[PDB]
């Protein structure tokens, strides 16, 4: 094979077609502004690619299969090493003054009038809240949040008749509230009840089913109380085998929710720049991961009768 | 305008033609390889958009009005960034375990963009473009033409080579003195081997015969007369005719750094999936020349106005 | 010289004191913290060291002679630089999941208690809006805005008996506005022209606004300026004769100033992400101006045009 | 706590001497090199720290427990996150000039960093000396990856037998594309690819020669066992089985370690050279047993049923 046939370099380097030069008179930094735009769409797609990959392994059952938690966690941490290149390929735009854009900005019609289609499709994938076909069915489709929710409300050790996680977890933070209780009853001890009202206020808040119902209609939660529970199933018994890759899932999750708001960040400081002067899907996750209960209080499993800890299912 | 249409995305985003997929089994990290050899071969595209038009202004003769000093200096810089991003891009090669291209390995080479940019900067149909390429002239010969007219060489004028050897010379008897009086001593002894040593080097700066003699065996680039006008721009860095100058030689050789640090991320991918070349050596070897401030020829205002005086 | 005796590795590697090994069970990833936030100090320190040298050379007088604009602008590149790295730091805080600093938080008493006396330190020198005296002293003392501001206001080509910029300007700008109407009335009464006549409108405010000396004063009061008239028109003739020497070294460095603050922001922004991901969750722009004047829509053939026989200013340096 | 008693800013803040500013007359980018290279060795007693408590969990059999395989993986990969960030922070010491470098060049006389020594050491790179005993005599990183991998599971003849069922499926893949090659008719394509066939066939059967490892070993060329070898080999074909999955993320850790080591290793030296005018691969098995061609379908299948071993773990 050619290397240019193989790549359709025919096609990819025969896309350059400058508007100074076209209407009117040649702008040299226009080149870099269509080449960096050309640069970005290449890795969106990429992005959708491994995006769409993933979310079929869950939609059609394979994630089940623990053999393909290596292959999910894997291309999950390539959508963030790909995202944080896209970071970086925003200091090549930096070397295009301001004044070197009002040159070409002439013959770029209305600003609010260009909007990437790939962009939209990918936020669309992950769950954020004929190219309208495409954006249809990335909108009506099951986005990664979904996909994610109704794993997660799979996770071993929930079940009521069985391991009772939040069943266990809520007595042993009641039982160990009322230690705390009694020990800061036997200046300092007026503060620390304070502390303690409020601490215990925030840990059984967790148990309260309605007020994360309610929090789900207002945009403040994603996934569902079930699937929330087996998130923080997966936090506590993270060094437990059948939790180690999930638990390196769920924070490929949130690298990527960190990295497309850094990614958003760096957007529109430059688009402020040049023009002149929430969006967290796995909000869950983060929220999850802040809160305040001592490793002693998290249920004691028992190797002899929970052996769904360190058996993996196919 | 249409963004898709302004950036023709029914070229860009309809050109990836999976091999595995056409010639049997779909393996899906082959659309990794080609859309990280086509973000490769765009960034090329702009180097050699960038490096072209710096190389337009020295040729076409622009370079001599020193008001485009400022886009010459920007837009190497501009190629060092897109550079610097291209070292970084190696890491989303890495995200592909080498068992994992060997599924894809079966059914699958040279850039001829990479070959038009080396010889362009002055590495030592597709045919036509390699001909032009190797025979038109490249950014070190460009560059080697502008320093041979750099100010203050003139002999019947600041003398600058003249001045220098003297003061070097001077200085060195001055050191020769200053060691041969010091206490005979471990000490002593030692550093008349390293005053020998550095006089040898200092000195050869002066061996015009020596130069040419190195640039036929490949060990140098500039001629005689551009490697002075560059150790004068070094030297006289601060006065303001040299500053955005010396910052055009700065990025000649962040040029050399990135593209050969480039190199070597290439070839240990290579070596991975598969199982010197300096063109500005000349600025890399003026940069290490141990020359004390206090021996530098000092520049009078009143006489030599062409230290902060420019010309178009 | 001993490695370790020249660098003073006795202080600087026997600082490391886990507070949870201290006061109870060692935690591991405590030293992380420790390492991090001393490798950001000796950063911070730093970028003090460059900054109070650049505002020295401004506020003694050395920027006058402009043979000490390479240092200016090579140091204010500097300063980008190792704050290009301390963002790219943040990745190894991510290192540390929430659930293992939940482990030593216990023994890092009230987050709402801890302050970066350097980082403070930092942002009055630039000129955000015992070691209290340190303190006292960087709000007191010329920050590098009020130095920038001073210099600005002494760029060649402002004084009105000379090349007289913001005079000129104006007339062109008033004169090349009149052709433009001019040109849009005798356009057909159309859906085209009649959209055209409210985009000149717009733009005949905006670009007439940079001559209304009283909304600038204005705007300073409210905080959304920060240069004086004069340093305001000192940039915007940088600006303009960016390719002129005299103008080259000085545009770099309004470019290095305004990437600073790009980079202070996205530190802040950065750091606030990191602060809500551990504890659960243009103000700051000290150039703002230099960041608006890159934002002004004048057509490069309405810049008042210079004559190498007259204006020697232009390619003639000074010491 | 007040924040700067906690870091010891009275400590880290005031250990910056310039040798120009005390012999003479203050040279100002000295002060750069001071906190670049205090920075450099901030980072190396970090790494150093994830290091240890690595080293630490194999030595004393924590790492026996697999609960704590995603605390080995997570440090390693901890370790690489601060190299790449002193990769990047070669970018500050480009920002002084090589001319500046010569103002403040003689007031510095040759230097050694006993923590990067340490370092080289502790991973298994062939008062302040009895650390440095410690770091030569102790078990590097190296032989403790070694005995671990000398342990994986399948290995067992009377078990699994992954090398005896892995050596029969190469030799009679090979003898398939042997007869497959001479089949077809006598052309350039044939008369190559038979090259193509004796060099692939030697390379393959050579991994089942445990006397020529040996030798290679001696010669320094190999550093894992055989029986290493043959784990970590385990480890790569089966890496998708769940028992695998986060050991072969401690292997691809390993080696990430060992290209960023010589990554750094080359700025480094293009630095010193810049300022003053798979030898160290220590995982060199774990990047050669990475560049193997064996086809999928010779792999041994795994049986459910039986090989209970690939889905179960052990504490
Ligand atoms: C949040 C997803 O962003 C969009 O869908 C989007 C968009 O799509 C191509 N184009 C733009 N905006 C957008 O919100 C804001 C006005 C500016 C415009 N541009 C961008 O930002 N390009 C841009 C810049 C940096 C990085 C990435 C992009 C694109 C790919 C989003 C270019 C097209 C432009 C700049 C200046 C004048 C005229 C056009
Ligand atoms: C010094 C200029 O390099 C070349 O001209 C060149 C080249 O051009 C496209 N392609 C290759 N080599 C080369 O020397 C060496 C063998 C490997 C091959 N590949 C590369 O390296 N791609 C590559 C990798 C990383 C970064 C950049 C490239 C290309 C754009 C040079 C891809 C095509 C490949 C990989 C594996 C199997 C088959 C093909
Ligand atoms: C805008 C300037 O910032 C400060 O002056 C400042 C500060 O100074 C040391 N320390 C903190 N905050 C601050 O606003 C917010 C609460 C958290 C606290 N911490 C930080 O952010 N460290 C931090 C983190 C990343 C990068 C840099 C820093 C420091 C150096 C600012 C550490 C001390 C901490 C974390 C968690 C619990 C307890 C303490
Ligand atoms: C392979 C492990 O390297 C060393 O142990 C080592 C060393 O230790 C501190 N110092 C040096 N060399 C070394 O081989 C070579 C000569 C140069 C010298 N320097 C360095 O490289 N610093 C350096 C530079 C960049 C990154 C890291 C370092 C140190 C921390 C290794 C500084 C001390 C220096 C520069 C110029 C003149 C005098 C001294
Ligand atoms: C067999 C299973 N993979 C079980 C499962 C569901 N959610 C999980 C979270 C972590 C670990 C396992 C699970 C499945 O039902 O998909
Ligand atoms: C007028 C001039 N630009 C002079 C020139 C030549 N080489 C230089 C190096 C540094 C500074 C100036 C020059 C020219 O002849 O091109
Ligand atoms: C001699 C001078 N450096 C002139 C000056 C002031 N501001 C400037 C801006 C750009 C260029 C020059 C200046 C001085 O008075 O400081
Ligand atoms: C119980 C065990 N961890 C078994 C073991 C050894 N090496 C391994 C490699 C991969 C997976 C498991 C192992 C041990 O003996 O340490």
């Given at each position: 094979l050619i290397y240019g046939n193989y790549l359709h370099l025919e096609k990819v380097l025969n896309a350059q077609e400058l508007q100074s030069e076209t209407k009117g008179n040649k702008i040299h930094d226009e080149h870099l502004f269509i080449i960096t735009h050309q640069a970005y769409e290449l890795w969106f797609k990429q992005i959708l690619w491994e995006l769409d990959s993933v979310r079929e392994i869950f939609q059609n059952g394979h994630?089940?299969?623990?053999?393909?938690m290596l292959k999910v966690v894997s291309r999950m941490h390539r959508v963030s090493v790909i995202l944080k290149l896209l970071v970086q390929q925003f200091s090549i735009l930096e070397t295009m003054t301001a004044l070197d854009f009002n040159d070409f900005r002439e013959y770029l019609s209305p600003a609010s009038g260009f909007q990437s289609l790939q962009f939209r499709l990918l936020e669309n994938k992950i769950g954020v809240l004929e190219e309208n076909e495409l954006l249809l069915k990335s909108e009506q489709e099951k986005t990664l949040l979904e996909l994610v929710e109704a794993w997660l409300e799979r996770t071993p050790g929930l079940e009521p008749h069985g391991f009772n996680f939040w069943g266990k977890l809520e007595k042993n933070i009641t039982r160990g509230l009322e230690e705390e209780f009694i020990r800061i009853q036997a200046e300092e001890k007026e503060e620390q009840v304070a502390e303690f009202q409020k601490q215990k206020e925030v840990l059984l808040s967790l148990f309260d089913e309605k007020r994360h119902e309610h929090l789900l209609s207002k945009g403040e939660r994603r996934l569902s109380y079930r699937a929330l529970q087996g998130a923080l199933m997966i936090y506590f018994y993270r060094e437990e085998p059948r939790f180690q890759v999930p638990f390196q899932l769920l924070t490929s999750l949130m690298d990527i929710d960190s990295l497309m708001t850094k990614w958003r960040y760096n957007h529109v400081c430059m688009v402020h720049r040049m023009l002149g002067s929430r969006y967290k899907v796995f909000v869950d996750l983060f929220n999850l991961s802040t809160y305040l209960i001592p490793r002693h209080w998290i249920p004691k499993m028992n190797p002899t009768i929970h052996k769904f800890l360190y058996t993996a299912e196919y």
């Open positions: 994630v089940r299969d623990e053999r393909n």
